[PDB]
Symmetry: D2
Subunit: 32 residues, 4 copies
């Protein structure tokens, strides 16, 4: 219930870390 | 190549909509 | 407390809507 | 102009780090 929310948050933080890495590779590529 | 960046922006925008949906589900579960 | 979390979520959803709009304008601009 | 897109990617990445920090604070507040 509440722990199910905490687990979903940790999943959502992992998904936003992969998005910030891929946004950083796209900024890199645009910068070349 | 620029096409490859535009496609990865489209995949990011679709993953951003999935997370906003998940966090709206959680904000519902909290009210 | 719990309502403070619900309010922060609504703030974070508004911030991710402005990021998805600006990512969409950047995709538009790259597409021209 | 491409410089303007790279700067707005940098502002998005800095706003993405602020949201992940906020959602880590909330996941702390829930444990």
């Amino acid at each position: 219930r509440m722990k199910q929310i905490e687990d979903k948050l940790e999943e959502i933080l992992s998904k936003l870390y992969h998005i910030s890495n891929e946004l950083a590779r796209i900024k890199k590529l645009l910068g070349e």
